[PDB]
Amino acid sequence: DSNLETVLNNDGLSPLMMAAKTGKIGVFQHIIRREVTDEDTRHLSRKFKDWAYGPVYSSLYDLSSLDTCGEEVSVLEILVYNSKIENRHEMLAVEPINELLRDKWRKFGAVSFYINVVSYLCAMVIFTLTAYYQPLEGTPPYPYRTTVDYLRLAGEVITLFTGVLFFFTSIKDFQLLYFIYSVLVVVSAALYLAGIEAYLAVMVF
Amino acid sequence: SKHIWKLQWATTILDIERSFPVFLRKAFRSGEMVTVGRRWCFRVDEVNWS
Amino acid sequence: VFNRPILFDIVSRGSTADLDGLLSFLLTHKKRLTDEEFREPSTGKTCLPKALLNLSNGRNDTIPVLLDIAERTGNMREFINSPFRDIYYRGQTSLHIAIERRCKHYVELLVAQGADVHAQARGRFFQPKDEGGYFYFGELPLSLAACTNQPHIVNYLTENPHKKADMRRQDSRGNTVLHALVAIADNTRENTKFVTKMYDLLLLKCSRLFPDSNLETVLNNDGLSPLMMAAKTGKIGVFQHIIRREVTDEDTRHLSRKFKDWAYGPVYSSLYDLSSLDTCGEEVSVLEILVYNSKIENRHEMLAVEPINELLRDKWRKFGAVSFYINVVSYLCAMVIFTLTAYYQPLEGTPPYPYRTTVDYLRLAGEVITLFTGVLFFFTSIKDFQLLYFIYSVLVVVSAALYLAGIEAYLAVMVFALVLGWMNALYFTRGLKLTGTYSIMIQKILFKDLFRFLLVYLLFMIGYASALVTLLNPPACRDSETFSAFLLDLFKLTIGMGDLEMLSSFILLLVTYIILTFVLLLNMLIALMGETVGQVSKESKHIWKLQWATTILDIERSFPVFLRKAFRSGEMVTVGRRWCFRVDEVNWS
Ligand SMILES: CN1CCN(c2nc3c(F)cccc3c(=O)n2-c2ccc(Oc3ccc(F)cc3)cc2)CC1
Numbered sequence A: 001d002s003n004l005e006t007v008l009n010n011d012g013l014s015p016l017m018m019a020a021k022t023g024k025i026g027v028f029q030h031i032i033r034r035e036v037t038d039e040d041t042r043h044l045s046r047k048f049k050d051w052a053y054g055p056v057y058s059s060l061y062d063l064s065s066l067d068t069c070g071e072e073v074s075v076l077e078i079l080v081y082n083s084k085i086e087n088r089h090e091m092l093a094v095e096p097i098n099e100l101l102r103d104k105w106r107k108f109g110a111v112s113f114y115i116n117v118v119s120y121l122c123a124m125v126i127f128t129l130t131a132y133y134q135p136l137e138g139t140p141p142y143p144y145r146t147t148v149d150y151l152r153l154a155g156e157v158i159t160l161f162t163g164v165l166f167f168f169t170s171i172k173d174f175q176l177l178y179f180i181y182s183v184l185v186v187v188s189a190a191l192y193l194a195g196i197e198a199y200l201a202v203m204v205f
Numbered sequence B: 001s002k003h004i005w006k007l008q009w010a011t012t013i014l015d016i017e018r019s020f021p022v023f024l025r026k027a028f029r030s031g032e033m034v035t036v037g038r039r040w041c042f043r044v045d046e047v048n049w050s
Numbered sequence C: 001v002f003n004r005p006i007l008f009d010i011v012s013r014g015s016t017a018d019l020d021g022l023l024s025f026l027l028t029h030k031k032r033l034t035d036e037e038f039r040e041p042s043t044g045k046t047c048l049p050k051a052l053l054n055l056s057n058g059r060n061d062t063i064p065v066l067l068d069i070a071e072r073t074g075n076m077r078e079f080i081n082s083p084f085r086d087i088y089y090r091g092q093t094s095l096h097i098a099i100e101r102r103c104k105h106y107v108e109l110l111v112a113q114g115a116d117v118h119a120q121a122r123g124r125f126f127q128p129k130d131e132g133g134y135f136y137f138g139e140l141p142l143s144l145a146a147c148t149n150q151p152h153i154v155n156y157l158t159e160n161p162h163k164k165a166d167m168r169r170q171d172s173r174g175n176t177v178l179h180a181l182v183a184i185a186d187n188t189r190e191n192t193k194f195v196t197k198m199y200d201l202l203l204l205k206c207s208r209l210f211p212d213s214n215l216e217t218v219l220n221n222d223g224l225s226p227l228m229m230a231a232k233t234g235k236i237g238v239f240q241h242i243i244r245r246e247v248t249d250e251d252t253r254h255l256s257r258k259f260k261d262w263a264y265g266p267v268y269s270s271l272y273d274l275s276s277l278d279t280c281g282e283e284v285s286v287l288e289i290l291v292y293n294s295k296i297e298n299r300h301e302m303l304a305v306e307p308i309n310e311l312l313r314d315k316w317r318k319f320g321a322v323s324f325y326i327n328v329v330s331y332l333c334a335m336v337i338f339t340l341t342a343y344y345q346p347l348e349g350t351p352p353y354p355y356r357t358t359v360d361y362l363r364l365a366g367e368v369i370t371l372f373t374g375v376l377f378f379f380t381s382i383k384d385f386q387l388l389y390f391i392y393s394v395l396v397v398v399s400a401a402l403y404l405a406g407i408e409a410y411l412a413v414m415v416f417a418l419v420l421g422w423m424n425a426l427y428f429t430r431g432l433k434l435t436g437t438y439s440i441m442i443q444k445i446l447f448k449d450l451f452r453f454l455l456v457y458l459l460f461m462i463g464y465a466s467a468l469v470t471l472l473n474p475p476a477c478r479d480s481e482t483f484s485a486f487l488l489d490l491f492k493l494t495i496g497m498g499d500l501e502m503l504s505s506f507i508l509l510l511v512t513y514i515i516l517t518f519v520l521l522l523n524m525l526i527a528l529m530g531e532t533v534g535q536v537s538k539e540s541k542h543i544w545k546l547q548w549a550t551t552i553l554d555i556e557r558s559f560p561v562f563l564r565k566a567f568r569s570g571e572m573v574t575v576g577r578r579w580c581f582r583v584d585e586v587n588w589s
């Protein structure tokens, strides 16, 4: 009815997860490639073998628990994020994981990453060119009264929206670095709202 | 580079997926239906000369 | 016998009696198994490949019944030639499936029945891995038997009583068995053994069958040829053997490479046949592809194959030291006279025609010889680090053109061309023994970190200038909404070297920002310096090998090689002119 591997400890880990977390490459290297041949009990296999063209074997590794699609705990997350792992040098090279990372890269790892880097870099450049244009001759609260100042306000508002949006991303989840970043930026924008003189200091920081 | 950079892009990929909703149509493969295993799977193609 | 699924079910389990009572009725209904309704609709596959994939440990005894059915139907070509109609596969007829299964027990029977032995498998699944496919074998049945290590299949197929297979016939890319077998090869040992042995076998078989032309000379649409493909793709495993092939059989020895000529007892003078390692600049040359090409996977060992490593030395000795030293002296003297034309450069105005006295006559002589050198070596560049001299010489000729009209202050980029030429001399002339790795450090550093600096620099400047403008500029520099670039100049001058304007006497910002910029400058400088110089150095051996290889090759490319400055010629006729290069080894056997 139920393969014994699915019985989870009070920690809610399960044998494969405990093997990964504690740093047990010896048993982890085997628990992923288990394909017990007995058909009556083959269903509890991992390295499903599907086809081959003679020189090429297309193994069908069963990552039924190497990524829960962010639903529950995932072996890849514990393997990579956790720093207490004794030896991640070889565990990442188990095989299905090393290729799952490449698959994620190809599918949604280059597009999203480059979009993100360009978005961030352009956001910071417009932040700099809002600084260089930063409201001059006093009048911090509402200086927007001309075309160039209208463009400056447009830059400032888009930058504030970017900051608050990517702060929303941070909260929904180097993360501290952006956390302090965005709290500072939103605080500075709040002080700007009232046009408090010399209070747009930590904005440049 | 080797393991340090491996971990670097691993973290980038994982937190990329964590950022936006993964459950959308941007996940990994699905496999055999029933009577043998849906039990999604990931297919790796090796080559051997046996 | 009503639908494909039941046919597949019966053939999978190896049951034939249950099918006899219905196949006879279908044959009585003037029906043929080749009809699409008898073939799986997704790909159009017949039951033959399905049954073959259902081999009972290679002992499928039903497929003879299928051949009997085919003979009864009276249709053989369409049934046997039953390609796959999807894009994932192409062709892949009974021969392909049988050979893939490593089944010699039935390929022979089905060919004896009469089967197409030249079906072209131009499939998406049959295209190189790095291009997008899964397994590439040359799109030929015989090439498929050859690639998959089936010597018996190749032998039988080329010696079957019925239609045989010709090794010469090529594929979409014009590959043939040799090209395919170079493609699948690796640099391992298990792979490189069957590949090399069977590849010599195919070559020698084609030779006996047809001694007119050795199969190695059949070139793909890329115009590469098996040796060239082996070199380019980075196949040291097969390249190391294709150059030392000396098949002893006299009837077919002529297609040998490591010709052996003489020995004095302790010394063997091998006569390697570089019939295609240098075309004297006539056609593609293996050395050029090996050295110039950067996509080559592993040039570390390929250059050390042996005939190449010694051909480079031979070129060095013959026309590699003379020409190189003449070139370096000519360039260095050209740049020195360029500098001493600059220091003398037309003075007191009068740019167009200042030549009116002895010293000015000498200056004009220097200028004209320098212009002639620039235009001549630009002619050399065009006839063919080449970009560096390209921009060099275009700049110099443009400056000379502006000089012709004597346009005031227009001889500006002339001096920039001077400095470009000097750094170019520092660049190219790396053949003066090994001195660390100067040029390679250039490229690894070059401008990479410099623009990172510039950018962080500019952001800090703008950031603290914005601090000032929200504070004072409507401070130190007269606070009157002034220019910012002067802030950059100040930051370079003092926070870089000294004599700051204090600028506060504000502070919360400036102190943190300046300590941060110092910290960043430190880390960037130190990290770059240490990591680049220490670890990734790999100073001399292969880096310098490639360096003088490039110098020698482009030296030969410069002037006409076909002149009396080439490599050796060898045996005349009845054994091989077939120029050759003799390397003298010593062994104590
Ligand atoms: C908390 N944090 C977790 C990891 N993410 C992250 N953190 C950073 C950090 F901490 C410091 C500096 C930079 C970043 C950074 O760029 N990203 C990031 C941004 C976008 C992304 O992929 C997308 C692209 C477009 C899009 F519309 C939605 C998503 C992936 C990562 C997100 C939040």
Ligand SMILES: CN1CCN(c2nc3c(F)cccc3c(=O)n2-c2ccc(Oc3ccc(F)cc3)cc2)CC1
Residues within 6 Å of the ligand: C323, C324, C326, C327, C328, C331, C380, C381, C382, C384, C385, C386, C387, C388, C389, C424, C425, C428, C429, C554, C555, C558, C559
């Ligand atoms: C395009 N380029 C290809 C390679 N060559 C070359 N490029 C350089 C470069 F790009 C930057 C800096 C320097 C050089 C350089 O010195 N040479 C060079 C010059 C002479 C030479 O051998 C001869 C000697 C005397 C003679 F009369 C005729 C030929 C061999 C090489 C030629 C053109």
